[PDB]
RNA sequence: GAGGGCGUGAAACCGUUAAGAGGUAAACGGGUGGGGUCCGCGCAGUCCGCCCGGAGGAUUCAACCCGGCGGCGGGUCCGG
RNA sequence: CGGCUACCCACCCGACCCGUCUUGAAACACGGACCAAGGAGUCUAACACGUGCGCGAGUCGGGGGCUCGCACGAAAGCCGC
């Protein structure tokens, strides 16, 4: 919207909002990052430390699909199956226990989190944080790993 | 002049809403009538929260609404939200507790409806209390917002803790010099 | 309206009318220049599959997938006869309608 | 909020005796100022270019 | 010519905008302020047969 | 309403192919109505008008009660001239005055055995 | 939803002249010109108009029936009333006064009543 | 002494020269409308006596007076007869004006309908026969 | 007042007519005064709307009831 | 008779010719004979912040597919294994 645009306001002021003395040319620093070591260094540091160098290895062919591990958390947990189900499986029947395979649902790793109530289930996985097997444990449940 | 003091005119406030909703005009209305006519600070902070942007009135959650009403004190009280109660995923048993709310989700609305509360909007709020007695004003995580983690008096200079802006989180960016003292300095 | 058999012919050339589906409802037909409230007919089929593709609030819609009806902001809004409700005017300071003006 | 009968009307304008209920679509909220934002924008997206 | 001409809108706000304008349709004050001749008209939102 | 994708609703467009139209289809845009009496008795409501039609002028300055015979039709001016209808120059020389041939009701034709092919095509197509 | 049809039509309606000068409604059933919310005779559920009668002679009374909306061929009941101009302004006045009907505009269909009265007389 | 309108009093303006542009006589190029100057070395800006006054808000004419004609009433523009008509409820403080377009056969139609319903018009007698 | 680069025909510039002025180059802001064009009005004769008491003529309701359709209002929410 | 006013003239007082570079311009600083038309913060991508709307632990079809061949339809509507 060129009739809400700041240039129609200004229509009218000499200098068009960029001073009489200081007279914005082209590039009165330079284009783009220029300047990142030698007079720039007070925007460049400390406003992004850390941007000059080398930090470690450099692993040749890097893909993002060989550490594909999607994290589920306790929370998490149950929800991944409807509420019908754990409510209609362990509404005082016997010691039987619903399994979440989060697999199916998309999530491999499985870490710890609180809020795991006292109806025991089991977690079919590929990975799993001690704390969520603790977790489990407390709870009574078992764990599983799949592959 | 006459004033040697400096001017500061107009203070801070936003004192019409600048959202074009007609429900929620008509509740500043209502509430604006109520908040000068029945000599009520609940009614002239739900007004002035109406008055409110859409940021600054954060979604609250279902958890925290019912912990809010889980301390002692606050048994047959109803929790009055300006702003959106939204579902948590975490929680599983829900209280029979009483909501007063704009725009409260499908799923929280579901869940209250399943577990006996009873929902209600501002109008039946103001049928129901014109002072606002037996109500409990709740408001939302202001700070847990991701753009108010960017903030503070630096990025790094202290280690300060706040966030730089960067495109990806990890390796080769932004980790050198200023970020370990094998580099160069340390912060 | 729907099942288009002959009505597109009957209202084709009528100057100011407009030809419209239910099954595709276009708001720049339904509410040109942006002013709500055109003039519309219906027809009985169109105005019984009306409910079917898009609910009530007890149900979705049945020919969609994942649309409900909006939550409305409030339930009952005449305004006029909530400030004249008793419970409202039950609770008011009084009608204080004095002016006292500059004084000189 | 309550949905009353409307008389289906015969080609020569006489109420028949067929009495469908309003749908809810009718009882719906009133954005206007919604109607017009996306009506701007559907007559962005209704357009050629133009000459360059 | 590569301005961005088109606005995409969320489909969620096309359906409400959709239900905001049936809704509005619906009220005789609002269409006879948009200026449509309703004064002989009988009920509003006309149903007629399926004959028509 | 228009449907077809191949024809023009341009305004350029059908002004350039009216004023450059060749002359096969300047005879079918210089066709003229008929009188009541004659589409009553061929079933035909309008032709193309050629060297010897009888023409009633019905509208401009001459206006009715005139029946009288063409003589010129310039193609190139879309202008007919009728034989009745006269003007004179400064110099008393008389002159034809322009006349467009939709302006223009054809009280008799002129019988040929191409016209009554074309008004036995006319009536068939009228059906 | 009669404030929500006044937060809809007080602006962007087929109405509205706002030349140069005060807005005005020109409004087909009213009695005071100004677009206001107290002055409007097509949002509310009870509206009384009056308007010059077709015969030339006396005024016609156009009254909201509010048995029932959405209806418009029977949501008017109209009344024509030619008499000696205070026997219709007592009745135009006991009509508004003695029922419920809209106690408000008392004044508006009084006044617009006495103006037409002494325009269509001579 | 045609209609005489309401209680109306002592119209001032508090000045009525309708504020010059700075050296609009100087070239003819400079219309005469205000145009605020933006200059540096301006004795206009500067405020300098003797100089122009620039137009600020101190001139603003009272609330009370403002956009009154000397008549008495308050213009407004009418097209037609029921733009004529709508002007049946205030008539003793809203005069009519009729719009230029307007031709003399609809014209006197026009203000004839504002001598039955006594609605002051600016211009009766103009574009007449 | 469309006459062959001819629709409309502005500014800069020029000719003539009408009006006014002229030693401090012209031009300007504030304030008046004079002149001229033009506008509104009748210029010692210009105000309206209500009520009441008087003066003269003409009409039929209204006051109360019967007859009638149309509407507001609420009780038994009779009866659906 | 009244009349402010883009008409003219006279009189009293004040009044250096505008634009910018500059600490400083009426300057013996520069551009400007006059007039009409054109003439200068746009568009794309990315980011940040604020505001407004919809949905809200989810959100988005911008990529395709489905509808009968419709001027507006190069639109709009729908996908949900
Ligand atoms: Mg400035
Ligand atoms: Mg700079
Ligand atoms: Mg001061
Ligand atoms: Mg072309
Ligand atoms: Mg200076
Ligand atoms: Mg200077
Ligand atoms: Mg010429
Ligand atoms: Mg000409
Ligand atoms: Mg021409
Ligand atoms: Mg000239
Ligand atoms: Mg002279
Ligand atoms: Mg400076
Ligand atoms: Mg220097
Ligand atoms: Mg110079
Ligand atoms: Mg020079
Ligand atoms: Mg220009
Ligand atoms: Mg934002």
């Known amino acids: 919207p060129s009739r809400l645009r700041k240039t129609r306001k200004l229509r009218g002021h000499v200098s068009h909002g960029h001073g009489r003395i200081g007279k914005h040319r082209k590039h009165p620093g330079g284009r783009g990052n220029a300047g990142g070591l030698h007079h720039h260094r007070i925007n460049f540091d400390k406003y992004h430390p850390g941007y000059f160098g080398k930090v470690g290895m450099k692993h040749y062919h890097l893909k993002r699909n060989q550490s594909f591990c999607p994290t589920v958390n306790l929370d998490k947990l149950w929800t991944l199956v409807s509420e019908q189900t754990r409510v209609n499986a362990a509404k005082n029947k016997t010691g039987a226990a619903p399994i979440i395979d989060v697999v199916r649902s998309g999530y491999y790793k499985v870490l710890g989190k609180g809020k795991l109530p006292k109806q025991p289930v089991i977690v079919k996985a590929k990975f799993f944080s001690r704390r969520a097997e603790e977790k489990i444990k407390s709870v009574g449940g078992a764990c599983v790993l799949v592959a | 002049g006459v004033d040697i003091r400096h001017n500061k005119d107009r203070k801070v406030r936003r004192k019409e809403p600048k959202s074009q909703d007609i429900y929620l005009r008509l509740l500043v209305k209502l509430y604006r009538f109520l908040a000068r006519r029945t000599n009520s600070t609940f009614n002239q902070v739900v007004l002035k929260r109406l008055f409110m942007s859409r940021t600054n009135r954060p979604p609250l959650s279902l958890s925290r609404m019912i912990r809010k009403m889980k301390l002692p004190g606050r048994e047959n009280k109803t929790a009055v939200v300006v702003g959106t109660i939204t579902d948590d995923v975490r929680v599983q048993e829900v209280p029979k507790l009483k909501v007063c709310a704009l725009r409260v989700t499908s799923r929280a609305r579901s869940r209250i409806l399943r577990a006996g509360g009873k929902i209600l909007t501002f109008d039946q709020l103001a049928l129901d209390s014109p002072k606002g007695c037996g109500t409990v004003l709740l408001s939302g995580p202001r700070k847990g917002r991701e753009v108010y983690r960017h903030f503070g008096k630096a990025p790094g200079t202290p280690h300060s803790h706040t966030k730089p802006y960067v495109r990806s989180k990890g390796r080769k960016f932004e980790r050198a010099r200023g970020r370990r003292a094998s580099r160069g300095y340390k912060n | 309206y729907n099942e288009d058999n002959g009505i597109i012919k009957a209202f084709r050339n009528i100057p100011g009318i407009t030809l419209l589906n239910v099954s595709k409802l276009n708001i720049l037909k339904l509410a040109p220049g942006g002013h709500v409230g055109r003039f519309c007919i219906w027809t009985e089929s169109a105005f019984r599959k009306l409910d079917e593709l898009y609910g009530t609030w007890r149900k979705a819609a049945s020919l969609k997938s994942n649309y409900n009806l909006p939550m409305h902001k409030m339930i009952n809004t005449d305004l006029s006869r909530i400030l004249k409700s008793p419970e409202i005017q039950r609770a008011l300071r009084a009608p204080r309608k004095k002016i006292h003006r500059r004084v000189l | 909020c309550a949905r009353p009968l409307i008389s289906v009307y015969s080609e020569k304008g006489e109420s028949s005796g067929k009495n469908v209920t309003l749908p809810a679509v009718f009882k719906a909220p009133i954005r206007p100022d919604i109607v017009n934002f996306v009506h701007t924008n559907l007559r962005k997206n209704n357009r050629q270019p133009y000459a360059v | 010519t590569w301005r961005r001409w088109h606005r995409r809108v969320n489909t969620t706000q096309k359906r409400y905008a959709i239900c905001s304008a049936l809704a509005a349709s619906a009220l005789p004050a609002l269409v006879m302020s948009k200026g449509h001749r309703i004064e002989e008209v009988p009920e509003l939102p006309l149903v007629v047969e399926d004959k028509v | ?127 | 939803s009669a404030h929500l049809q006044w937060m809809v039509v007080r602006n962007c309606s087929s109405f509205l002249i706002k030349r140069n000068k005060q807005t005005y409604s020109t409004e087909p059933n009213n009695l005071k010109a100004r677009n206001s919310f107290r002055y409007n005779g097509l949002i509310h559920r009870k509206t009384v108009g009056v308007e010059p009668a077709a015969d030339g002679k006396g005024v016609v009374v156009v009254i909201k029936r509010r048995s029932g909306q959405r209806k418009p061929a029977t949501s008017y009941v109209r009344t024509t009333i030619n008499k000696n101009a205070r026997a219709t302004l007592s009745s135009i006045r006991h009509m508004i006064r003695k029922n419920k009907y809209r106690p408000d505009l008392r004044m508006a269909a009084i006044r617009r009543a006495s103006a037409i009265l002494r325009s269509q007389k001579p | 002494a045609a209609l005489r309108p309401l209680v109306k009093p002592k119209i001032v303006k508090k000045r009525t020269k309708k504020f010059i542009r700075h050296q609009s006589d100087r070239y003819v190029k400079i219309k005469r409308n205000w145009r605020k100057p933006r200059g540096i070395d301006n004795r206009v800006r500067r405020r300098f006596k003797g100089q122009i006054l620039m137009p600020n808000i101190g001139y603003g004419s009272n609330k009370k007076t403002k956009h009154m004609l000397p008549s008495g009433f308050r213009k407004f523009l009418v097209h037609n007869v029921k733009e004529l008509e709508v002007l049946l409820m205030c008539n003793k403080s809203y005069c009519a004006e009729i719009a230029h377009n307007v031709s003399s056969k609809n014209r006197k139609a026009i203000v004839e309908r504002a001598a039955q319903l006594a609605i002051r018009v600016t211009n009766p007698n103009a574009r007449l026969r």
Not at chain 6, 60 to 89: A, D, F, L, M, T
């Open chain 6, 1 to 127: 309403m228009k449907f077809n994708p191949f024809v023009t609703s341009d305004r350029s467009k059908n002004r350039k192919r009216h004023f450059n139209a060749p002359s096969h289809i300047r005879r079918k845009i210089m066709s003229s109505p008929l009188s009541k009496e004659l589409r009553q008795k061929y079933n035909v409501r309008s032709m193309p008008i050629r060297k010897d039609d009888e023409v009633q002028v019905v509208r401009g300055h001459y206006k009715g009660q005139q029946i009288g015979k063409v003589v010129q039709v310039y193609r190139k001016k879309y202008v007919i001239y009728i034989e009745r209808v006269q003007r004179e120059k400064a110099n008393g020389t008389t002159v034809h005055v322009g006349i467009h041939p939709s302006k223009v009701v054809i009280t008799r034709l002129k019988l040929d055995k191409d016209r009554k092919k074309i008004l036995e095509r006319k009536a068939k197509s009228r059906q």
